[PDB]
Amino acid sequence: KVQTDPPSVPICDLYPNGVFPKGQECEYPPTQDGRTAAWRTTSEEKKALDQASEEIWNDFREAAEAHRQVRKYVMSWIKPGMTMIEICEKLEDCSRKLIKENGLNAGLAFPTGCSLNNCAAHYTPNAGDTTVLQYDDICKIDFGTHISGRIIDCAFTVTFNPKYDTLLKAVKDATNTGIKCAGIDVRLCDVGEAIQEVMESYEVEIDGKTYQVKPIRNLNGHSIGQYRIHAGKTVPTRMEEGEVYAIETFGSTGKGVVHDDMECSHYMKNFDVGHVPIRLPRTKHLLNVINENFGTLAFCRRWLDRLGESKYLMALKNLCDLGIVDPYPPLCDIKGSYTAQFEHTILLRPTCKEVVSRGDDY
């Protein structure tokens, strides 16, 4: 069983024994005293703890392999001239096939971000959006897969004009620095400081203007929990054994701060909201659809459309106003600025740090 071109075979079918490829495995950084953490690799008790969660890591690995195969495919065809809707639908069709989508047990972890230019995150087109990808666009492809709610959050930036090359390099270096710095017992603030230092060491020139690259200070890496993209720890307290993090950085030629802008596409149930009885029929129906199809995973309007829902906007506003669902509008820096992103998911296993979403690409 080999993968097709275009990819269509589920990752599950490529690996008969149910054992999926490990990501990049790394020794933890030396502790603050200077002594190595390499003892974790060979510790019999850490090995036992690690093995006790093998099922879980194996789920992340399956999801990461889908992510690698999907994004390699995307990079082969994404071109100016395509509509943003076309791009998102072609990506998502492939992701559903490779993840072997099955209700809440396997599927897409959150909508395909394809944020453009000064917009850094949380843009995906709604129905009727006529936006076309341009030669000069800088596009952040941020998409997620999951198996049993074990989420891969992983993202890269697409460009066609070499003028952004050094901006991309800066952000990639900053993200890799964050990944290198991460570790059990490492303070979240120290990971953030390392990211900032690296990113600010780059100066770039774009259309005759020079900039020192700025990290976006209100767009942070975060812990990841089961069915919970943001589990409550942010990378601006310590990282702990067994936690999972998205290490991400955003570089900007703008102010280095984002604000809500444009039409909202992304929504997600508040993880901490329980059962709320609703009588209003369209609102009740929409909540049921959300509970059945997404649970606490993020969704977008296009995903409601594809389920055959219509006339739901007022119902969706009602759920937002009730605090049951939260809106996540696009987050953008100033007009005319450029933003770039790279992101990986890392597992803080008892024995080592695994960049589970690492590929040959980034």
Ligand SMILES: COc1ccccc1C(=O)OC[C@H]1CCCN1c1ccnc2ncnn12
């Ligand atoms: C501090 O911001 C938060 C605090 C609590 C809960 C959620 C968020 C929050 O911003 O959640 C945003 C999620 C929901 C919509 C899509 N989105 C995505 C998409 C792609 N990659 C992502 N990495 C992290 N989130 N995220």
Ligand SMILES: [Mn+2]
């Ligand atoms: Mn992401």
Ligand SMILES: [Mn+2]
């Ligand atoms: Mn993230």
